[PDB]
Amino acid sequence: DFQQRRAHLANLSDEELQTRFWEMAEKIVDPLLDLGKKNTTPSIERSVLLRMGFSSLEAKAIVDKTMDRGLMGKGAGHIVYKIAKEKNISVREAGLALSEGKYWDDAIQ
Amino acid sequence: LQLRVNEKLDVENILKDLDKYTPKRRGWTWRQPAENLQMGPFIYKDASTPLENSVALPSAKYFGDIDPQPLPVITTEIASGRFEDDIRRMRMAAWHGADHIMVIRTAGQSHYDGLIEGTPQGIGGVPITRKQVRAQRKALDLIEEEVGRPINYHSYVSGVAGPDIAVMFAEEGVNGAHQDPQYNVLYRNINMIRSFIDACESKTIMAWADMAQIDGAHNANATAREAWKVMPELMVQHALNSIFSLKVGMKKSNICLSTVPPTAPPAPSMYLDLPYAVALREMFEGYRMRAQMNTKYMEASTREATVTHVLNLLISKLTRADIQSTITPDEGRNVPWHIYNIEACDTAKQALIGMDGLMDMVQLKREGVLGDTVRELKERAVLFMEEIIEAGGYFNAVEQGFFVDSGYYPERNGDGIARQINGGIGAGTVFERDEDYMAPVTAHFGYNNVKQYDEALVSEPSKLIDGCTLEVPEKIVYIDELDENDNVNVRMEETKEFRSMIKPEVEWQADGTVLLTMFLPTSKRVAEFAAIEFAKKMNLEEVEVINREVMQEAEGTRIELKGRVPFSIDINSLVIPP
Numbered sequence: 001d002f003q004q005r006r007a008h009l010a011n012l013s014d015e016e017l018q019t020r021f022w023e024m025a026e027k028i029v030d031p032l033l034d035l036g037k038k039n040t041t042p043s044i045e046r047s048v049l050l051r052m053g054f055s056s057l058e059a060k061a062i063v064d065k066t067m068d069r070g071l072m073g074k075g076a077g078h079i080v081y082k083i084a085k086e087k088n089i090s091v092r093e094a095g096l097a098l099s100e101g102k103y104w105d106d107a108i109q
Numbered sequence: 110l111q112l113r114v115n116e117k118l119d120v121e122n123i124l125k126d127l128d129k130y131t132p133k134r135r136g137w138t139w140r141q142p143a144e145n146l147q148m149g150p151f152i153y154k155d156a157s158t159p160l161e162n163s164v165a166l167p168s169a170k171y172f173g174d175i176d177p178q179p180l181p182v183i184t185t186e187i188a189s190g191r192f193e194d195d196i197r198r199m200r201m202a203a204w205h206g207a208d209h210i211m212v213i214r215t216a217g218q219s220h221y222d223g224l225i226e227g228t229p230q231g232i233g234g235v236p237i238t239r240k241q242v243r244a245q246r247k248a249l250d251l252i253e254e255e256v257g258r259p260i261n262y263h264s265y266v267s268g269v270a271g272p273d274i275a276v277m278f279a280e281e282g283v284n285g286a287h288q289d290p291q292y293n294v295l296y297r298n299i300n301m302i303r304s305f306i307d308a309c310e311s312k313t314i315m316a317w318a319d320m321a322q323i324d325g326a327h328n329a330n331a332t333a334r335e336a337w338k339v340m341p342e343l344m345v346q347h348a349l350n351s352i353f354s355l356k357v358g359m360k361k362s363n364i365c366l367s368t369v370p371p372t373a374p375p376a377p378s379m380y381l382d383l384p385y386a387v388a389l390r391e392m393f394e395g396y397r398m399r400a401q402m403n404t405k406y407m408e409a410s411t412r413e414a415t416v417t418h419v420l421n422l423l424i425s426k427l428t429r430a431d432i433q434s435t436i437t438p439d440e441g442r443n444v445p446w447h448i449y450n451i452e453a454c455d456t457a458k459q460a461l462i463g464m465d466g467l468m469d470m471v472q473l474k475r476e477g478v479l480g481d482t483v484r485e486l487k488e489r490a491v492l493f494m495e496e497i498i499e500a501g502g503y504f505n506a507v508e509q510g511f512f513v514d515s516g517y518y519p520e521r522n523g524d525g526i527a528r529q530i531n532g533g534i535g536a537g538t539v540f541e542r543d544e545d546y547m548a549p550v551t552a553h554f555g556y557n558n559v560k561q562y563d564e565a566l567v568s569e570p571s572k573l574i575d576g577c578t579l580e581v582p583e584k585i586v587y588i589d590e591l592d593e594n595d596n597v598n599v600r601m602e603e604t605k606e607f608r609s610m611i612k613p614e615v616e617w618q619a620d621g622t623v624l625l626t627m628f629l630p631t632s633k634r635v636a637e638f639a640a641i642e643f644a645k646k647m648n649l650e651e652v653e654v655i656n657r658e659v660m661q662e663a664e665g666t667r668i669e670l671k672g673r674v675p676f677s678i679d680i681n682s683l684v685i686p687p
């Protein structure tokens with residue numbers, strides 16, 4: 001079993017065996033990292049909001065609504081940025097607005 | 110400001126004005142090496158700077174109460190359900206050498222899909238919120254000036270809202286955290302695609318805060334039948350999270366492996382666990398070694414726990430350990446008591462000091478049976494890695510039950526934990542980033558289209574808003590309480606009474622628990638039941654047995670009992686001379 005398997009490493013040197021262990025470790029995590037670059041999730045979106053000056057309660061409502069209108073792909077902190085500038089209010093006020101159910105027909109463009 | 114070594118911590122005062130508290134510093138601190146240090150008549154080779162205020166070892170009386178401190182950062186874990194009582198157990202550990210205070214999340218926090226707020230009571234752990242975290246970190250600021258050496262507050266960044274708590278930890282100067290997206294999948298059955306996409310953010314936020322990161326490969330140590338056979342997979346779980354954390358942006362010097370010697374006597378545990386310890390440290394150079402102690406092969410005996418732990422400290426000394434966490438000797442007897450967190454520190458400090466300079470005098474026989482097994486474990490792990498690629502990536506390997514299988518890999522029993530790619534908690538919560546996706550904040554990982562609004566701001570996204578909370582703390586929404594009857598102010602009010610009577614406690618103020626040890630001249634079962642009676646007559650309540658040991662079948666039985674004293678004493682009616 002293990003002796004059969006270990007065939008091709010047996011004459012690998014410690015430097016080769018180590019560099020090979022990390023070489024493959026790297027190739028295994030890469031697809032994971034890419035998935036991480038091109039995609040988003042609710043907790044991530046909520047966290048962007050928290051940093052943007054929103055409370056956990058307010059953040060939930062925006063992301064809960066963002067998901068309904070199918071807008072995750074654009075970014076929840078982005079929905080709150082474009083609506084802030086468009087209607088000329090503070091990031092905070094336009095984020096409160098949205099949380100409460102407002103400016104959602106508008107955000108869709 | 111404030112803090113007299115003879116006055117208790119005013120936990121009533123620490124809880125006030127938490128809306129205006131700010132962490133005093135950020136990130137991890139290590140111990141300052143103190144070269145050829147002279148304490149009393151002795152010279153120490155492997156010591157760190159002395160504490161300004163501390164409780165030295167009982168036997169330090171024969172030597173002028175000297176209190177030598179070793180080089181590794183020393184962890185103790187304290188989380189009872191009531192963060193407010195524990196702030197006192199913290200102060201006792203700090204005095205005993207612990208400079209890494211680690212706090213367990215209330216049962217099920219992994220599944221909280223968002224932060225919680227305020228201070229409800231915990232179950233088998235503290236509920237981690239901002240008030241509570243600001244509280245404990247404010248108390249540690251005091252406690253660390255008292256002792257004269259910084260203390261790393263640590264907690265957990267797991268769950269379906271890891272990224273959430275990463276922020277809050279970043280804001281509130283939590284110094285260290287666990288972060289390993291493999292924990293979510295294997296033990297909490299959170300969905301793997303969302304779990305790993307989340308860890309990218311989680312980890313970035315953590316790297317921004319300069320926090321230290323501990324992984325959870327050691328978890329596979331416990332949930333595992335014959336722990337010595339798990340050694341190829343440990344290397345695999347340590348490697349995945351490390352190369353991952355590394356490529357996210359985290360510094361190699363802030364990435365800690367959580368490495369526990371898998372065995373304990375009567376196994377020849379040194380012989381078994383040492384090649385592994387060496388293999389790991391050779392294969393992971395430049396990464397940190399956070400040694401933990403044995404919990405799986407534990408039982409009701411404190412004595413036994415301690416001896417196995419000293420052997421655990423011995424694995425660390427023979428090799429290397431940047432942090433040396435501890436486990437209470439009573440871990441298998443009950444939920445840790447004040448006196449036993451302190452035993453854990455004392456013992457860790459005592460053993461390390463007694464082995465000062467040991468490696469100037471001893472060494473590893475690096476060729477022999479040792480190097481052979483160091484080589485074999487390495488091969489077995491590389492093999493495991495080869496098969497995870499062949500099967501076409503990490504998700505497929507998980508789904509095929511590659512992990513948590515009780516076989517000494519390449520051996521596979523089929524008893525491993527299989528999660529579905531498309532299933533779990535949080536399935537269907539991944540969303541594709543669109544071309545014009547943006548996020549106006551520091552510490553964001555994935556694709557962030559910033560150019561569109563300003564080509565210049567690409568590397569400072571938060572300047573679209575004149576600072577995210579990481580630059581502008583005053584933008585942090587602070588919640589105080591969200592429950593009127595379940596919070597710290599009710600709990601503290603409940604017992605104003607006590608702050609001029611007194612009673613014994615193990616975890617919570619005046620909980621009335623005590624420990625009784627006795628010997629009975631009869632077999633165990635009977636001995637045990639006869640034992641309850643004696644305790645009852647002694648006026649204790651809620652009596653239960655927590656340890657039986659056979660001295661010899663017929664001759665005798667040692668019994669140990671935890672029980673509640675149903676009354677108080679008065680410090681003012683105690684006749685005390687000089």
Ligand SMILES: Cc1ncc(COP(=O)(O)O)c(/C=N\CC[C@H](N)C(=O)O)c1O
Nearest residue numbers: 214218219265267268287289292324325
């Ligand atoms: C990597 C990781 N993330 C989260 C959690 C737990 O946190 P929640 O259950 O609330 O998600 C754990 C727990 N076991 C670790 C033991 C610890 N080192 C101790 O020394 O006992 C973990 O290993």
Ligand SMILES: C[C@H]1O[C@@H](n2cnc3c(N)ncnc32)[C@H](O)[C@@H]1O
Nearest residue numbers: 225226227228229590591592593595
């Ligand atoms: C059961 C739990 O619900 C939370 N919670 C969130 N919002 C509220 C609210 N408006 N009133 C009471 N509890 C609330 C608490 O954090 C609490 O402890």
